[PDB]
Every structure is written in structure tokens, then in C-alpha cells.
Amino acid sequence: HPLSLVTRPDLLPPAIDVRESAPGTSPGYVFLAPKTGDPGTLQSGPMIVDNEGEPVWFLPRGIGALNYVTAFQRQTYRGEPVLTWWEGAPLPTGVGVGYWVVMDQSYREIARIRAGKGHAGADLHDMQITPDNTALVLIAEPQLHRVDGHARLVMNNIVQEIDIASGTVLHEWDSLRHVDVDESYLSSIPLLPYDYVHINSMSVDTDGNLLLSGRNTHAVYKVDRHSGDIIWRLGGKKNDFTMAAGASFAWQHDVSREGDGTLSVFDNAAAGSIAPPGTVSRALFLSVDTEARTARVDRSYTSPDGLLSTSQGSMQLLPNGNVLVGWGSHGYYTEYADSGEVLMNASFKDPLVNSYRALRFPWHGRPTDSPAVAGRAGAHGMTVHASWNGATEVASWRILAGDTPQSLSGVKEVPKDAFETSATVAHTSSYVAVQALDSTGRVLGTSKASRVR
Numbered sequence: 001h002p003l004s005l006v007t008r009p010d011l012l013p014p015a016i017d018v019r020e021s022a023p024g025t026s027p028g029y030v031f032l033a034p035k036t037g038d039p040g041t042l043q044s045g046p047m048i049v050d051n052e053g054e055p056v057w058f059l060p061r062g063i064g065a066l067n068y069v070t071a072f073q074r075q076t077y078r079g080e081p082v083l084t085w086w087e088g089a090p091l092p093t094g095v096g097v098g099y100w101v102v103m104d105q106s107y108r109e110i111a112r113i114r115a116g117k118g119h120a121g122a123d124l125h126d127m128q129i130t131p132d133n134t135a136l137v138l139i140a141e142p143q144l145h146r147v148d149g150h151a152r153l154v155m156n157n158i159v160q161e162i163d164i165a166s167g168t169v170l171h172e173w174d175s176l177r178h179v180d181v182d183e184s185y186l187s188s189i190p191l192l193p194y195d196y197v198h199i200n201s202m203s204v205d206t207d208g209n210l211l212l213s214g215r216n217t218h219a220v221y222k223v224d225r226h227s228g229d230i231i232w233r234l235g236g237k238k239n240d241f242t243m244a245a246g247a248s249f250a251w252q253h254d255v256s257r258e259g260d261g262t263l264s265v266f267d268n269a270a271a272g273s274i275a276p277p278g279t280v281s282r283a284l285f286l287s288v289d290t291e292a293r294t295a296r297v298d299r300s301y302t303s304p305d306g307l308l309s310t311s312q313g314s315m316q317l318l319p320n321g322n323v324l325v326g327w328g329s330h331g332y333y334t335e336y337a338d339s340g341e342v343l344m345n346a347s348f349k350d351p352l353v354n355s356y357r358a359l360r361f362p363w364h365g366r367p368t369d370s371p372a373v374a375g376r377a378g379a380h381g382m383t384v385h386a387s388w389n390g391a392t393e394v395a396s397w398r399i400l401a402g403d404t405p406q407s408l409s410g411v412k413e414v415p416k417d418a419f420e421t422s423a424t425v426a427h428t429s430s431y432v433a434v435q436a437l438d439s440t441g442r443v444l445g446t447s448k449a450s451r452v453r
């Protein structure tokens with residue numbers, strides 16, 4: 001697991017093993033938020049890696065076990081590509097109270113999305129920036145609710161649509177207001193708040209209505225954007241559609257409408273003893289017929305390692321037709337072709353490290369700092385180390401050497417082959433520096449002059 005970096009001893013990004021990387025893997029980078037279940041004694045935060053698992057960007061923003069990072073992905077705000085992730089405190093039911101960070105391509109925070117007034121914070125499970133520059137945020141707050149005549153404590157879910165610039169709440173959807181408690185499949189703990197629906201995904205369908213994934217009800221709800229009425233229920237105790245054998249899902253995550261028209265559902269299909277022997281989690285693409293009220297499996301993708309993710313997970317349809325799956329509780333992620341052939345299979349070197357999602361996006365990082373450099377003298381001469389956290393366009397490094405910071409001269413150019421590239425030179429100098437070069441040889445940035453040690 002994380003070996004020391006010479007130029008950045010403050011960064012300890014988790015290591016990843018790519019057991020298979022066949023040709024045809026979609027371009028772009030993989031977005032992860034590694035965590036040690038929670039405080040793991042290892043760094044955690046948003047991470048961007050390449051197809052070899054080598055880190056491209058890593059930002060430690062963990063605060064022990066009182067405040068951690070999850071649900072890292074790329075979104076679009078005001079037509080510009082941005083980074084979003086969640087930070088906050090965990091709760092016993094597995095939900096959290098926190099906020100969402102919005103950061104630009106220069107890696108500075110440009111916005112922070114919080115729950116509306118009157119609520120402690122937003123839940124960690126999902127958040128979606130709409131093309132209307134609004135925020136779909138999930139609030140999970142305990143409320144007293146009369147079930148079977150008994151007053152009980154239940155885990156209510158509120159979905160708010162919030163303008164980013166003003167923070168004003170434009171729409172609000174109360175789950176206890178449309179979904180009954182006895183629709184849940186989860187057994188009742190007498191002291192814990194009854195997490196009856198446990199929404200973990202929010203998506204906007206092609207018609208503008210909302211698609212909400214209820215984990216503990218095994219159901220997907222189509223909600224009118226304005227009136228808040230439930231259009232239909234897919235799965236669960238009040239299912240509107242006819243299901244085949246393997247079309248029914250359970251404890252599912254990450255539901256969205258795809259370009260081909262199918263509905264994507266990550267069927268975890270199990271929980272942690274609170275599943276039939278042999279079941280595996282599967283990535284589901286379903287064709288739903290609203291006229292006949294039926295839904296069948298278009299295609300499904302299973303793990304080559306026979307994994308059964310009891311929680312978390314993600315799926316993504318890539319532009320070339322590939323399917324990228326994040327196995328959630330299991331620290332694996334797999335990219336398939338349409339035919340189901342495995343193109344990329346990767347896992348964290350530490351088995352205790354996992355990520356909520358594993359998504360692929362193109363990214364163009366423009367760091368506002370300078371490259372980091374370090375030089376160590378020796379018998380051969382000098383060994384020069386170079387890194388630039390967040391830089392995506394660096395193709396090679398130019399090594400500068402000189403006796404004074406003002407008399408630096410270029411001695412050697414080497415390709416970038418890792419997050420931190422190391423190269424030796426047959427000379428010994430008093431100062432070294434590096435220049436990051438893109439594929440055409442244009443200079444992207446220059447490090448400070450570093451005294452050789």
C-alpha cells in the first residue's frame with residue numbers, strides 16, 4: 001500500500017492493482033473516494049486515477065472518524081466541468097450529515113451545497129447538479145411518525161431542489177408524505193430510527209420527472225417534478241410492473257435513465273445478514289414498458305470475481321458502449337464491453353479500502369501551484385524526482401540543473417511514467433528544477449529551484 005513520495009511526503013494515496021487492462025478501455029480517468037470503511041490510519045479523500053491505477057490527483061480531506069469524504073464524481077455547473085464530493089459526519093443508520101463541495105478545474109472550491117434551512121445537513125448517498133444550475137440534495141432527518149398506532153422514530157428522507165447561487169429551496173419532497181412505512185423490507189430495530197426507504201440515488205428522467213432509488217423498499221419511484229406525486233413504483237411491495245425471474249432487484253443503488261432508453265439499476269441483491277447462497281451482485285439494464293406495465297432485463301453484467309456487494313456500488317454507461325461498474329463494499333471496479341467481455345479489472349491493494357462509486361470521466365486539470373521537484377546527489381550524479389498533483393496534460397519532464405537558481409540549464413528530458421517520475425543524470429549540480437511539458441513539447445509549468453541534497 002502507499003509508498004512514500006519524495007516530492008510530496010504529505011500525499012499517501014491508496015495503491016490499486018489492475019489485474020487486467022485489455023485494449024478498448026474507454027478514455028478518461030477513474031474517479032474514486034477511497035475510505036477504510038469509515039479511522040483506518042490511512043489517508044482518504046477524492047482521488048483521480050488512470051487506467052493503470054496510478055494516481056493523477058489526490059486531496060486528503062479526512063478528519064478522523066468525525067468527518068470523511070465520499071461520493072466523488074464529475075458534474076457540470078454553468079456549462080463548466082466541476083468536481084463534487086460529500087463531507088460530513090456519519091450516523092448509526094449508515095446515513096450522514098454534511099455538505100457537498102463544488103470545485104473547478106483549477107482545484108479551488110467555487111461553491112458549497114448544503115441542505116435547506118431547518119435541517120442539520122445533507123445525506124451522503126447522492127447529489128445531482130441539474131442543467132438548470134440547481135441542486136438535488138438528500139436530507140435524512142429522524143421524525144416521529146405514527147405506525148400501527150404506535151409512535152415510533154423513523155428515518156425520513158427529504159429531497160430538495162436548491163438553487164446553487166442563492167441556496168434557496170425551490171422544491172421539497174417528503175418521503176413519509178408519499179411512501180408508507182410498511183412498504184419497507186428492513187427489520188425493525190427497537191432503538192434505532194427505522195430507516196424505512198433509504199433513498200440513495202436521484203436522477204432526472206428524459207421527461208423532466210425524478211427517479212428516486214429506495215434501497216430498503218427495493219423500489220424505484222418516478223416522482224413528478226412539481227406536484228411531487230408518485231407516477232409509478234418499480235419493484236417492492238407495491239410494484240406497478242410485471243417482473244421476470246432475474247428482473248427483480250433488492251437493496252439496489254444508482255438508478256438512472258440511459259441514452260438507449262433502458263433504466264440502469266445496480267442490483268446489490270443482498271445485505272449483511274440484517275441472501276440465498278450463491279447470489280452475486282449484478283449490473284442491470286432494464287427495458288420498462290409504461291403502456292403494458294412490464295419490465296425485462298435488457299442485459300446484465302456480473303463480477304469476474306463472483307462478488308456480492310452488501311452495500312454501495314455504482315454503474316455507468318460509457319460513450320463507446322462500455323459499462324463501468326463499481327462494486328461498492330468490495331474494493332473492486334470492472335469495465336466491460338457490450339458483449340460482457342472484461343476490459344479492465346482493478347482492486348485496491350489494501351482489502352480494507354473501498355469506494356462508494358467508481359466512475360469514469362474525461363478531465364483537464366489546471367493546477368494553480370507549480371510542479372514539485374527534489375534532487376538527491378550520489379555516486380552516479382543526481383536523482384531528480386518530479387510531480388504535479390492534479391496535472392493531466394504532462395507528457396514529459398525537462399530536468400534543469402545549475403549552480404545558482406538564475407543559471408539553470410536544461411540537461412535531459414524524460415517521459416512521465418508515474419504520479420512522481422524519477423530520473424538520474426550523470427552530473428552533480430547545486431540546484432535542479434523541472435519543467436512540465438505536454439505532448440507537443442510546450443511548457444506547462446516550472447518548479448522552483450531546489451537545492452540538491
Ligand SMILES: [Mg+2]
Nearest residue numbers: 126127128202
Ligand atoms: Mg449523481
Ligand SMILES: [Mg+2]
Nearest residue numbers: 254256315316
Ligand atoms: Mg449511474
